[PDB]
Amino acid sequence: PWKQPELDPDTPSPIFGGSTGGLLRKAQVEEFYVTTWESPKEQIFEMPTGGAAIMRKGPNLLKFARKEQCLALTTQLRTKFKMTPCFYRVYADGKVEYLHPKDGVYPEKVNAGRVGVNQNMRSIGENVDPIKVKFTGSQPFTI
Amino acid sequence: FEQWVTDPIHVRPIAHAIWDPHFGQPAVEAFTRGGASGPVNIATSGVYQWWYTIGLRSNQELYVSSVFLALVS
Amino acid sequence: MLETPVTSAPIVANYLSNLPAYRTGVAPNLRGVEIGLAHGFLLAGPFIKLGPLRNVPGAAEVVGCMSAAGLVLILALCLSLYGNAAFQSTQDPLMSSEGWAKFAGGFTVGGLSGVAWAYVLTQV
Amino acid sequence: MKDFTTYLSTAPVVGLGWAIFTSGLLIEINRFFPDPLVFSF
Amino acid sequence: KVKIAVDRNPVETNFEKWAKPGHFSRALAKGPNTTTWIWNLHADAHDFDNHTSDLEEISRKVFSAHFGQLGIILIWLSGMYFHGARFSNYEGWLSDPTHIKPSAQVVWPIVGQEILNGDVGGGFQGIQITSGFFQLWRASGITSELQLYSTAIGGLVLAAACFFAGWFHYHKAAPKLEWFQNVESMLNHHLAGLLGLGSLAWAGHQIHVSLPVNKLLDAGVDPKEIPLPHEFLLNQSIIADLYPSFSKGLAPFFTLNWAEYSDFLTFKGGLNPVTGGLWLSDTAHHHLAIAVLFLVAGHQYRTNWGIGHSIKDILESHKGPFTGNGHAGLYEILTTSWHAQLAINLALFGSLSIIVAHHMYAMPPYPYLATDYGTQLSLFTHHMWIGGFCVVGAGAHAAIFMVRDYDPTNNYNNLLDRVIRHRDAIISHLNWVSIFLGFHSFGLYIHNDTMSALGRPQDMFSDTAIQLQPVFAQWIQNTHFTAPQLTAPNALAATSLTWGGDVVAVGGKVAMMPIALGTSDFLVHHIHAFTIHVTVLILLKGVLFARSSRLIPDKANLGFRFPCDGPGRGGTCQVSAWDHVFLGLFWMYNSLSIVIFHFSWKMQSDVWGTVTDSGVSHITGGNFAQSANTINGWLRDFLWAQSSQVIQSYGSALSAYGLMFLGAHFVWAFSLMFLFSGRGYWQELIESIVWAHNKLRVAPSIQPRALSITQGRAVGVAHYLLGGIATTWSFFLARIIAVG
Amino acid sequence: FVPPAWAPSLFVPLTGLVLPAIGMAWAFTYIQKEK
Amino acid sequence: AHVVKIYDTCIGCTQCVRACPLDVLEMVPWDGCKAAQMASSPRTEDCVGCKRCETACPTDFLSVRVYLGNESTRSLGLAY
Amino acid sequence: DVAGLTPCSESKAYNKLERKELKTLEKRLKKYEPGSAPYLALQATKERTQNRFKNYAKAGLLCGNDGLPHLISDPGLALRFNHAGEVFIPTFGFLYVAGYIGHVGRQYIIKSKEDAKPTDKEIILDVPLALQLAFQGWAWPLAAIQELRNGSLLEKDENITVSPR
């Protein structure tokens, strides 16, 4: 949004037991994703990595090994309770990257502040044949 | 090859000898065919008939042909 | 993350603590020697029992012992291959490259020693 | 009546009717002409 | 609290919705535009959970559908009884059951199929039936065709009554949701009335009707000269002559001197030497004891009178320290989710069908049933396959419940939540167990085949080289052979002849004999355990990963039945729980095929045969001890040594079995094009055919489309199962009829 | 010319055990070769 | 990773972004459509190629196209 | 006597096969009393077999070396040896019936498209219209070649749905 929020590792995790489909060795070798939300009350939700957990009244922090799990939890919280969460990506060296609300308004909106990239300005089916682009390393859809 | 050249009707061609330490003694005895000293495979590729037709008769001719083809390769 | 009574048992914890792989109190050569001794001694077992020469007395134990030695050598070759092809890039010395090479050398030394010990025990 | 007729006008029902009609015609032809092979008037 | 709650006329009986095919769902209510709609019409027909979100309407539809299935079953039973009444030689079979084959289906002479009406004996022509209905009617005291006619008419009347009952209980008087949710009343009425009262009624029929008719039939008198069952019912002189304890006239029952009933309520465990079946007095006391036990069990739950047990209280009370909330939210799950109850019912029904098959080949509970080898083989195979289908449908509907009816709010730390919480460990351990079993069984078979082909019979895992004898099964067999000796002294003999004893034969054919267990039996039993373990692993992975997984975290939002999630993450084809059930269906088929092959070979080699003065000469000469240890033995001594009757059946009454064998091979082969391939190829082929019909202006208004990927998988697995099942059916029946 | 009688006792174990073993060793080092 | 390409036939209906399970697409202002929205892929390195965006496209043919190739840890959907 | 084959009446293997079939039918018949329904059923089967074997003979059918009759498919050769009734006449009859089916289906496809929701008429058939088109298809080749003449049988390549190259 106006200012990118900074994650807090001291935020309380939701009330949950032990997960089996949790973070593997990739969490301590490669990047892992961390989802934060602000629950106004305590309620039971379903994690994508196992059974069910109970979120605490306040900030809530969860860890996952895949971005798809983070976005699945985000859309579950948005559809079920309208929570509007946000997840960061933390690498092995501790670098933190802001992932979901890039402009803080969610990708469903526009905000008139994002530059559209990887947009072909020609119609589909007007691309050149693969014979035209041969021994060049450029795909017909990449021009 | 020479025995098949002498009698192309009765005795069967031999493809290659079998040396398998996993073979048992009845299996070794059962695979001794065509008047061989060990377990052999009956040839079905038909190179015996072809090499008899083109004029090869002796084993030395096959030896020199094989070494010449190895040199060619 | 899911703690269990059998994984977090203190008896299981101290049984896995003093194992040669998880001791972290000795050089990799000694751990390899112990590993090779134990695994060669157990691997000689099925070879002196059900080999192709098991009906022939005397020669069955010898044939099983050389087969166990060959299996130990194959396992040592695969251990050396894993050490060379795993730790070729950047506190436990076992996870290092030359540490794993010394572990493999200890493993094959222990394997042949255990095969000889099993031969002595079967002869006696 | 017309709702039941439109139910009978559905594709599986008329297909079933065609099935019984054709099967009965062929069966009665085979019964009253036992095992013919060549058209000989 | 428990009371009848019924709404009066919620649905009007009008044909206006019969005209519209797609009406139960709003997706199909708009009308058809492509051909995939039509399949969607025949796929979501019974998906009542998707038509409406109201549980009351779903429960009413379930009640009506159950009434319809009972009406269909009663129609089929009445038709079976009618075919036995008119187009059958049951009266001829009653005179000599050991020489006239049971026949109840007669064909019409139309195109040369009259050769299928074989010479079954007794001056009759027809198809030799393997259902065993003749033995069931002989066990029920049925003598004349008039009784079969009356049973058929009563079955038709009860089928019409049940069909009207379904119409009434749906359209006229529809029960409410509170009526269906009274699980305590349902369990009490089912234990006491559905099972116990029926058991007591069948016991009374066996005492008053079946036992005297069976005793007179075993005496050898003419069935026409046998007195009618009502003569036994009313007049007490014949029943006193046949059983002196009937002269007391209900005195020992109400004076607690039940030992006086020992003449016609016996405990002579074993086989009747006259007929090779179970003793009817033993079955009478059995059904009486079962009725007493079920009437006792039916007064367990509290419904309206204070006393009883509460299912919710029992489930909440049984909580341990290692399980957290032990069985906490299961009562709410099983009272709101139809699919959980469907999974439970299907699992228990399939397991009980397997039990029925095993304990029916073991003890033949019918007169002249064990002599008919074909009837026993067909019944065992049929119950085996129905049990397998039911237990795979249990996993299917459990996965459906997991996708649809699971609520995380009611499952926080209960047993289902912990099972989901360690499903990965469950699947990993089951995978390791399955791999180890498959190695140490199939690799043993490959080892035997290799060392046989290498000329090392002493290196094989056979009954002569390496004795891997089933010491536990042999010890259990020896203990159960001594069960009447020391632990059950009131039994006259052993509970079955499989444990040990002597050979019981009827008409020169062996009815039952002790079954020896060797290394081949251990190998095939461990092979069966391995196949069951793999199928369990597949279905459990489908059930537990139906909602989410590491590969797909939002699988619950995709539904239970979806083809894939695209080629992403390397490819997500066949990732749904439906596809897991579709994969496990083949493994169930393979498991049960190996099981029935083991049964057929073992009972043909070591059980069935003829009995001469020298001894018992079996059908295959007991090759199972020396041929079942290798795959080539099954290939040659079981599949090639047999199946010669099927291929040589042409020109005889068994030629329909050969034709059905060829058609089954055809359907099994035709299934592979749906099992393999995909959808885009057939879609473009259909596009080319659309162009062809558009050139001739015969393009249909309904756009033809290729079958869906899920639909294509369903068609492939259905045709594959049908082809394999009919292949085994034709081969088994032809082999067991020609040489049996 | 004619190979000796011990050639099946040497070449067959060489191309059945030793040569595939060294081939798999070279291939395993080539697969996991990193920069 | 995979290549996500969006053409000018998009009507800005935002269905592809809602169908995206990894937050790859976005909506930018545009003038070539009535809704004044255009789909973009600024996070194509996180796309796995599930083709869920192509299912939600209402236009004939496809206004968004996913081309697989050069799979990585993020592109293969691996938690390990 | 074409293709080195003999007529069924002149052949010996044909009579041997008929004798074998009569022998096995009589063997099946001898196990039943004459006053029983299986006896009449087997007698009817034997009579049908004898009638079929008589009708296959004296009808131009010929069999080679096995007694099983053979069919000649080439026109002209079948015309000059009275074998046209084997396949030549039945193939023309099947072509007539198949053209009847195609013309009836084409008429129903065309006649049910100039109305609202033609798929509804496709899925719920207009039974009087279907029967009317059923009884109007007796002159299918005339109407087919007339539609070919006026060009309404075939659609032009401009109004036809076509796949991209």
Ligand code: CLA
């Ligand atoms: C002791 C009383 C009694 C008896 C005998 C039954 C018997 C049956 N119930 Mg039922 N049930 C009962 C009480 C009883 N119920 C109560 C009190 C409740 C409410 C809590 C239910 C709720 C219930 C549900 C929700 C369902 C059943 C179903 C069934 C059938 C199970 C299928 C089967 O085994 O086929 C056995 C079949 C036969 C033996 C054939 C003859 C069946 C006759 C016609 C039934 C006669 C018993 C009947 C209950 C008498 C009262 C009806 C009367 C007004 C005419 C079976 C007919 C299932 C069903 O719908 O099946 C149709 C089902 O899904 N039951």
Ligand code: CLA
């Ligand atoms: C459901 C099973 C069943 C059934 C139907 C019967 C039925 C019968 N048994 Mg059996 N029996 C059974 C189980 C059964 N038993 C079991 C489990 C045992 C244990 C071993 C026995 C042991 C046994 C022995 C040892 C004997 C019988 C006998 C009898 C008969 C005597 C009936 C009697 O006095 O009972 C009591 C019956 C009643 C009180 C009648 C019921 C009340 C009526 C129906 C009221 C009708 C009122 C109505 C509104 C008015 C008429 C309407 C009209 C005007 C339209 C009867 C045919 C005896 C026999 O055959 O001799 C005759 C005999 O010797 N049975």
Ligand code: CLA
């Ligand atoms: C106790 C019995 C029972 C009951 C009440 C249900 C009820 C249900 N099941 Mg379940 N199921 C069962 C047993 C049962 N099933 C078993 C035993 C299996 C394993 C085989 C399955 C496997 C299964 C799957 C995989 C699925 C269901 C689904 C469903 C739902 C809709 C079914 C439907 O619309 O089919 C409509 C009817 C048909 C499609 C016709 C099927 C015909 C088959 C494929 C071929 C028949 C071959 C026949 C025997 C021989 C024909 C030969 C030919 C020459 C004529 C419904 C909740 C579906 C669902 O969405 O659940 C909510 C679903 O996806 N079930």
Ligand code: CLA
């Ligand atoms: C005969 C063919 C065949 C074989 C061997 C396998 C083997 C396997 N499948 Mg199966 N499968 C098959 C057909 C087959 N499948 C078909 C047709 C289907 C379609 C329905 C499936 C569907 C299927 C599913 C759905 C699943 C499996 C699983 C498994 C594994 C179980 C492991 C096990 O218990 O056995 C151990 C393996 C063997 C006994 C292989 C036999 C070969 C010999 C004995 C082993 C040693 C060979 C040799 C000595 C070593 C050579 C070394 C070198 C020269 C190469 C294993 C990899 C399951 C799995 O992943 O694991 C649990 C699983 O979930 N398969």
Ligand SMILES: CC1=C(/C=C/C(C)=C/C=C/C(C)=C\C=C\C=C(C)\C=C\C=C(C)\C=C\C2=C(C)CCCC2(C)C)C(C)(C)CCC1
């Ligand atoms: C004589 C004969 C023969 C021969 C034949 C021939 C040789 C033929 C040819 C043929 C040809 C060479 C053909 C061609 C064709 C082409 C085309 C191009 C076509 C078209 C068609 C159409 C278009 C159709 C249509 C239709 C339909 C389908 C439906 C409706 C109706 C109609 C008819 C219209 C044989 C020996 C075999 C057998 C015997 C007889």
Ligand SMILES: CC1=C(C/C=C(\C)CCC[C@H](C)CCC[C@H](C)CCCC(C)C)C(=O)c2ccccc2C1=O
């Ligand atoms: C062949 C095939 C198709 C094409 C199959 C189609 C379109 C289904 C065709 C069904 C027909 C129309 C059934 C009726 C057939 C006869 C016309 C009816 C009987 C006629 C006689 C009574 C005369 C798929 O769509 C497919 C999809 C997914 C995986 C595999 C496959 C696959 O293998």
Ligand code: SF4
């Ligand atoms: S789904 Fe298609 S039309 Fe809609 S916003 Fe995305 S690219 Fe544009």
